[PDB]
Design a protein around this ligand. Structure first.
Ligand SMILES: [Zn+2]
Ligand SMILES: [Zn+2]
Lengths: 99, 1335
DNA sequence: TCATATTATTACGCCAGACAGGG
DNA sequence: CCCTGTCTGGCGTCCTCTCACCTATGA
RNA sequence: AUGUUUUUUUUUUUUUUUGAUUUGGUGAGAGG
């Protein structure tokens, strides 16, 4: 099985799972620890922001690849803003501070 | 873009500021059409239009007026994702307190209003009343009231009196709670009391009272008044395949809260009576509490069928919340997965990758390449071209592959060598071809395994895959110094068959002018691959400074050793191939090649090793047959001699001469002896079976048996497995844990019958159950370790210290187990090591000890090295580059940046699978004696007896290093003395552990002081001997009239005056303990070394209990202060022990549980770190008593003992840094001139920078005290709540952070993996240097 | 079809952490 | 009042693949 | 040398760009 780009889920902006659903590989927790074990800071940054979740990042990246410019414009993951709204939907005021 | 994440409470004004419209109706959707509800949960005006830039109902179907809201639609006009960020709010009719601040353990409202949880819930569920500023009545403010208590009060205090209930009353209490006022009171209460329990109970209440005043969190924000609703997009309502909507659980929760709130508003309209609106508000309280955190209240609500439905807190917490399932691990585009296979033609920087996966993973690069050439125009055309797969896109694909690495990943990645980057080579096929040597890194066999491929998209990621994660760059395991590209199984058989010899072959003893014609004689058919031969080889030894000097000579060698010499690079000597080359020898061949010639010859030489091993293993034809497993001819007579022996033992058992346990022990002993004899018979019969003549009489050699080369080469097989295929397969054990007395005398070449196979299945089912349940604890151990580490980044170059732990070789009592060169390899010395002669600067004080320095250490026989350890590093927030050590997979020091906490945690937890889950001293060598911790005396006979319990007996050799060590008890008969030379095997120690010696220092006469027969001691004349002994009783058997009497022996002179201790003016009286029996009676003159009484008496969960720092059930008790010791009160729960120091203050004591067999007498002076009883010892006692270096030596020795018992090589840096992360918190003792509190627990770097910026001023600092937290308590007690929330319980940590108003200055690895940016360790450390500089 | 709103099983194994009881 | 059983909560491995099954009521 | 010398309705509207190809929990079983 292989996936470059196709459909994703509803709640989250990450790719679907499985083969019958044309989906990508779950880059799990211990693989993130293995990339932290190296100096792979940029590989991990595209591994969890551009390739997976951030919608503006992935559309800009697809257009940047097909122009011939391997460069990522990262932004913030969508599932973290989902986390902010689920935490904030309690009586909890979680924010994002100064520039 | 943004610094720290701030968490605080949500005010009702803040919740109305989040909101965009009140969600009234609970009606979800229409359900018969497609439209929602106006205005229900899924509204239009409150949130937004379903369709993008459209009024859902009807107006604006173009792009001109985005925003207009007509009365017929009551709809906003924006994007489809606008509803995902917009949230609604439910105006709760009746106030409802939060469940996270009422049941968090400890509750936030429980230790703030000074009221028990039980009483808080009673009033909260409309079952109890609470008073609130009554007035001039006889009632308190916190005191509650019941129906009867209120009824009577109602008729009594009908006027000025307030007694409400529920959240409303609670809210008022919190609202009317002067925070500041309580502070002073609490502070004054803590300074006006001495109660230990109260002190801790008051310090925990004042801590959460002053923390609330420090932030902008109000006391009335605990109760929920304006409940917030999560965005619809985040609670999606999609239908499955069919005609119904599979609705989420949160819609059930919100719809019930809104149904109940509408009912409660209608009842407060209608003026229903009291009990109706109490049940109505109570059902609303339980509905809100079920929405927020379901199931924390009594049994959780359920929709379909009996399974409870999932609430908001269950969208956060757990293994499947947002942290562990969508933020730490994500699903990933440009990724693939398939079954692996070998492909041995590869070079070790490249892997095979199928054409179909390659054309799917590289669709955008192919699109960009196709658009560059000009073959097509629009993007559609290119997608049709690769959907059709024409003849021109495969050249495009070979031009996008070429220099573009991919990340191969095996699915259980345990350490960092399980993600490696290759270059693709395209494969006709559907299976990833993976280079074989690399398999030993992935733990990948080829029995059905699968791997995932990931594509580095951007340019920095291609460079990170080539420069950090390439497979040529990972040739040493980061856990140690051992190479991980060791040749595994076929190739060592090909080498072991190639470089060997036989006593006659084709071309025996002919002479050859080079290795080239050695291979030419092997190929043409004129010699054999193993035929001993003088060749002329030219080995290049590089003895100058970087210059290779040729020396050519004639080596008496074989043909195969010359053929393998054609592949060895220049610098290695010929003697690396002159031996037989098993697996350990080829591993040290690649290791010496890496240490001498560097990286590139070692990569190309690893490939040439693998190619020549595969080729000559193919030419070998090394099969396995049924005749290869040679049965010993002596096996049947050994079994019959064992059968005669068990027959003799059972004939004694019929006549009852021996006991049953001694029978079972004798049967297990003779079957162990017969098993060892059968193994030696088959091992001789395999290791030297070949006996071939050469030009005359016969001559023997090691065998070319196939199973023996598979065992001796170390390819696959050991002694035990080849033992079970030929000799008997031992004594298998039943699942009771005890062994079975009748062994399995049949191997596998003979047939096992039925019972023997069933006993075998006992033994093997236990092993499969152990692995399949062991793996969960191994993985959870790696998780706890990488979440306690998680932060620690090499961030300096020198901390500027002179402290470091004292690396000695470790010695258990056998031969010296782990040499000093294994422990001080590549670790930077603390002070400069003196050469063992006299005062020489052998090595300087900041040199890395690589192999050349360690060889000059081994030549001089250096005792022990004071070396720098990670736990002694002075760097605030990180570890400096010298106190870590060598890079371990790079030859140099650790770079500024490389995350060492994560590689250390992986290197400790990765061998978690291989670990298991469930008289006197006899010297061995011949050397010199030395004693430490010794205070001794010469007895009458001459044997130096010892008056100290804790004496260490070292055996030092003639060179200076310490070769043996032992522990000698109080009062043992030493055959030798101090500084003496002995012989190998001579007994040097003797004692009796069943009889605790009460030996003396001086001589004289014996008097019975406080020894009265009848109450103190008893008369027990011996039965079978007649020589009686006055038996000393204990303090429990005698009655209360004489229980105060302490029996003792004090030595006098010939007159009767007390003979004093030499050095003091005190007599030497020995107080006899309980259960003693007097050996030497009254009037008998004594000497030293003679007793005065007879006193009769682990694998992987050990690693968990060392890092998590549990206490053992019966710890060894110690002394918190030095000085004289005494006893106390007679058995009220415990038996007291009072320690009065010589110069220090007296009042320390401890109540010992009296079930322990003590070690100390009444006239004994103790010390800190000195034992009082025996058994295991808790690490907190080591930390608060001996020192920090003592507890780090304790953990690294007690866990390298597990990792060495199971045989795993791990360097000690990793355990020292997880020990650093254990003892990172501290507690204050004297607050000093700072802003801390008395017994406040604060982290160590904070208090050290505080009193280091105050001590640089005039003010003297604050004196701390370090504390050792276990790894899950230490990773949950962090100054970064996302780090402590991605890990275990999120409810406790988020309420603690919310009511404290905590802020997360990100500054670690997992905060930046959550929030989606660069890691502040690796390549991103320059980015975080830049961002930290530009503030 | 369109609002009404929650009851008659037990059978893990530590391991911390808080709580009423009593010498 | 300091030990103490006793009770309550909170953990318990990653990755993947196949299949089936989904609230009752109701004038 | 010369041409108002057989006229009659045998009739004028495009594509337009502006947007995408759509699948959530529970429980059971297998591979490594
Ligand atoms: Zn409209
Ligand atoms: Zn340091």
């Amino acid at each position: 099985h292989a996936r470059s780009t196709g459909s994703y889920s509803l709640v989250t902006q990450q790719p679907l799972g499985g083969k019958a659903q044309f989906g990508g590989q779950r880059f799990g927790e211990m693989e993130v620890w293995a990339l932290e074990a190296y100096g792979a800071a940029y590989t991990l940054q595209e591994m969890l922001t551009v390739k997976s979740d951030d919608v503006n990042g992935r559309t800009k990246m697809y257009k940047n690849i097909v122009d011939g410019n391997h460069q990522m414009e990262p932004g913030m993951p969508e599932s973290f803003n989902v986390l902010l709204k689920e935490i904030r939907s309690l009586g909890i005021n979680i924010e994002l501070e100064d520039e | 873009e943004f610094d720290a994440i701030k968490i605080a409470l949500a005010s009702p004004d803040m919740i109305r500021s989040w909101s965009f419209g009140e969600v009234k109706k609970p009606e979800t959707i229409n359900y018969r059409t497609f439209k929602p509800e106006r205005d229900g949960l899924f509204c239009a005006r409150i949130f937004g239009p379903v369709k993008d830039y459209e009024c859902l109902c009807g107006k604006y179907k173009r792009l001109k007026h985005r925003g207009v809201i007509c009365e017929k639609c009551g709809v906003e006009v924006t994007q489809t994702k606008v509803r995902r960020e917009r949230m609604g709010h439910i105006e709760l009719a009746s106030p409802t307190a939060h469940i996270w601040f009422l049941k968090s353990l400890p509750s936030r409202i429980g230790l703030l209003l000074d009221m028990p949880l039980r009483d808080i819930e009673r009033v909260l569920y409309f079952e109890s009343y609470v008073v609130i500023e009554g007035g001039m009545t006889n009632l308190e403010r916190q005191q509650i009231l019941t129906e009867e208590q209120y009824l009577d009060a109602l008729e009594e205090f009908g006027d000025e009196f307030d007694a409400k209930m529920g959240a409303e009353a609670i809210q008022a209490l919190l609202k009317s709670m002067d925070l500041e006022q309580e502070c002073e009171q609490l502070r004054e209460e803590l300074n006006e009391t001495n109660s230990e329990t109260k002190r801790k109970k008051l310090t925990k209440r004042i801590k959460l009272l002053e923390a609330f005043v420090q932030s902008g969190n109000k006391p009335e924000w605990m109760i929920l008044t304006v409940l917030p609703v999560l965005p619809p997009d985040l609670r999606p309502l999609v239908p499955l395949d069919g005609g119904r909507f599979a609705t989420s659980d949160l819609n059930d929760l919100y719809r019930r809260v809104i149904n109940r709130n509408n009912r409660l508003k209608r009842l407060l309209d209608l003026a229903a009576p009291d009990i109706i609106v109490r049940n109505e508000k109570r059902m609303l309280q339980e509905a809100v509490d079920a929405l927020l955190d379901n199931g924390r209240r009594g049994r959780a609500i359920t929709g379909s069928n009996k399974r409870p439905l999932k609430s908001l807190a269950d969208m956060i917490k757990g293994k499947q919340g947002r942290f562990r399932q969508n933020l730490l691990g994500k699903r990933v585009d440009y990724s693939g997965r398939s079954v692996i296979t070998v492909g041995p033609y590869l070079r070790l920087h490249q892997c095979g990758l199928p054409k179909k996966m390659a054309l799917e993973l590289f669709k955008p690069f192919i699109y960009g390449k196709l658009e560059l050439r000009g073959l097509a125009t629009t993007i559609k055309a290119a997608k049709k071209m690769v959907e059709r797969e024409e003849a021109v896109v495969w050249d495009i694909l070979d031009e996008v592959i070429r220099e573009h690495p991919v990340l191969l990943n095996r699915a259980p990645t345990l350490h960092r060598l399980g993600i490696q980057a290759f270059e693709p080579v395209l494969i006709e096929g559907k299976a990833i071809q993976l280079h074989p040597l690399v398999c030993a890194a992935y733990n990948a066999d080829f029995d059905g395994d699968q791997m995932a491929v990931h594509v580095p998209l951007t340019l920095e990621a291609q460079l990170e895959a080539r420069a950090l994660m390439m497979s040529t760059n990972n040739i040493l395991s980061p856990a140690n110094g051992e190479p991980i590209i060791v040749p595994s199984q076929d190739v060592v058989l090909g080498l072991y068959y190639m470089t060997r010899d036989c006593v006659n072959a084709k071309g025996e003893g002919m002479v050859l002018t080079g290795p080239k014609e050695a291979e030419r004689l092997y190929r043409s058919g004129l010699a054999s691959l193993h035929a001993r031969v003088k060749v002329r080889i030219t080995e290049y030894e590089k003895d100058a400074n970087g210059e290779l000097v040729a020396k050519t000579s004639l080596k008496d060698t074989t043909v195969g050793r010359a053929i393998l010499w054609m592949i060895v690079p220049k610098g290695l000597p010929y003697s690396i191939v002159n031996q037989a080359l098993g697996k350990k020898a080829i591993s040290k061949m690649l290791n010496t090649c890496y240490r001498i010639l560097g990286l590139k010859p070692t990569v190309i030489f690893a490939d040439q090793i693998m190619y020549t091993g595969f080729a000559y293993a193919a030419r070998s034809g090394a099969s396995v047959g049924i005749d290869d497993m040679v049965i010993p001819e002596k096996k049947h007579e050994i079994i019959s001699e064992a059968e005669a022996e068990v027959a003799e033992i059972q004939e004694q058992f019929q006549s009852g001469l021996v006991t049953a346990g001694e029978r079972y022990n004798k049967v297990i002993d003779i079957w162990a002896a017969a098993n060892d004899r059968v193994s030696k018979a088959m091992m001789d019969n395999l290791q030297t079976e070949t006996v071939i003549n050469r030009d005359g009489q016969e001559e023997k050699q090691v065998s070319f048996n196939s199973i023996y080369m598979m065992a001796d080469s170390g390819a696959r097989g050991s002694a035990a497995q080849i033992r079970q295929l030929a000799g008997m397969r031992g004594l298998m054990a039943k699942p009771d844990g005890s062994i079975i007395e009748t062994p399995i005398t049949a191997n596998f070449r003979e047939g096992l019958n039925v019972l023997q196979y069933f006993i075998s299945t006992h033994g093997a089912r236990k092993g499969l159950a152990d692995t399949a349940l062991k793996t969960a604890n191994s993985g959870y151990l790696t998780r706890r370790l990488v979440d306690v580490a998680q932060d620690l980044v090499v961030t300096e170059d020198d901390c500027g210290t002179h402290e470091g732990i004292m690396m000695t070789p470790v010695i258990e009592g056998g031969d010296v187990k782990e040499p000093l060169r294994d422990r001080v390899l590549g670790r930077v010395t603390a002070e400069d090591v003196l050469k063992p002669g006299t005062a020489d600067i052998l090595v300087p004080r900041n040199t890395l000890l690589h192999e050349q320095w360690c060889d000059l250490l081994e030549e001089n026989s250096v005792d022990a090295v004071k070396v720098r350890s990670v736990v002694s590093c002075d760097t605030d927030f990180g570890v400096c580059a010298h106190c870590y050590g060598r890079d371990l997979a790079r030859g140099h020091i650790i770079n500024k940046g490389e995350a060492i906490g994560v590689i250390a945690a992986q290197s400790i937890g990765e061998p978690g699978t291989q670990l298991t889950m469930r008289s006197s001293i006899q010297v061995k060598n011949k050397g010199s004696i030395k004693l430490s911790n010794v205070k001794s005396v010469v007895n009458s006979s001459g044997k130096l007896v010892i008056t100290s319990r804790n004496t260490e007996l070292k055996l030092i050799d003639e060179f200076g290093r310490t070769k043996e060590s032992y522990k000698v008890p109080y009062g043992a008969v030493l055959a030798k003395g101090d500084g003496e030379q002995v012989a190998g095997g001579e007994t040097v120690a003797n004692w009796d552990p069943h009889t605790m010696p009460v030996i003396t220092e001086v001589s004289g006469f014996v008097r019975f002081t406080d020894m009265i027969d009848g109450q103190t001691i008893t008369r027990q004349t011996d039965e079978l001997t007649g020589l009686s002994s006055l038996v000393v009783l204990d303090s429990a058997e005698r009655t209360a009239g004489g229980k105060d009497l302490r029996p003792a022996l004090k030595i006098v002179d010939a007159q009767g005056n007390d003979v004093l201790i030499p050095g003091t003016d005190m007599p030497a009286q020995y107080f006899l303990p309980g259960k003693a029996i007097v050996q030497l009676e009254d009037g008998v003159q004594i000497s030293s070394g003679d007793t005065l009484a007879r006193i009769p008496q682990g694998g992987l969960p050990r690693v968990a209990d060392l890092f998590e720092a549990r206490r053992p059930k019966e710890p060894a008790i110690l002394a918190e202060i030095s000085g004289i010791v005494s006893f106390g009160k007679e058995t009220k729960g415990k038996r007291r022990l009072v320690i009065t120091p010589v110069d220090g203050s007296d009042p320390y004591e401890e109540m010992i549980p009296k079930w322990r067999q003590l070690n100390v007498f009444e006239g004994e002076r103790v010390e800190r770190g000195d034992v009082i009883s025996d058994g295991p010892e808790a690490p907190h006692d080591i930390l608060r008593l001996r020192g920090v270096h003592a507890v780090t030596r304790y953990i690294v020795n007690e866990v390298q003992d597990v990792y060495r018992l199971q045989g795993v090589k791990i360097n000690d840096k990793h355990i020292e840094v997880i020990v650093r992360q254990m003892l990172r918190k501290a507690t204050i003792v004297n607050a000093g001139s700072s802003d801390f509190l008395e017994g406040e627990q604060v982290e160590y770097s904070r208090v050290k920078i505080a009193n280091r910026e105050l001590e640089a001023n005039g003010k003297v600092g604050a004196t701390y005290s370090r504390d050792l937290l276990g790894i899950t308590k230490a990773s949950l007690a962090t100054e970064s709540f996302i780090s402590a929330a991605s890990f275990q319980e999120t409810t406790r940590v988020l309420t603690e952070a919310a009511v404290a108003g905590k802020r997360d200055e990100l500054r670690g690895l997992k905060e930046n993996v959550i929030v989606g940016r660069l890691i502040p360790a690796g390549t991103g450390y320059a980015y975080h240097q830049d961002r930290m500089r530009r503030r």
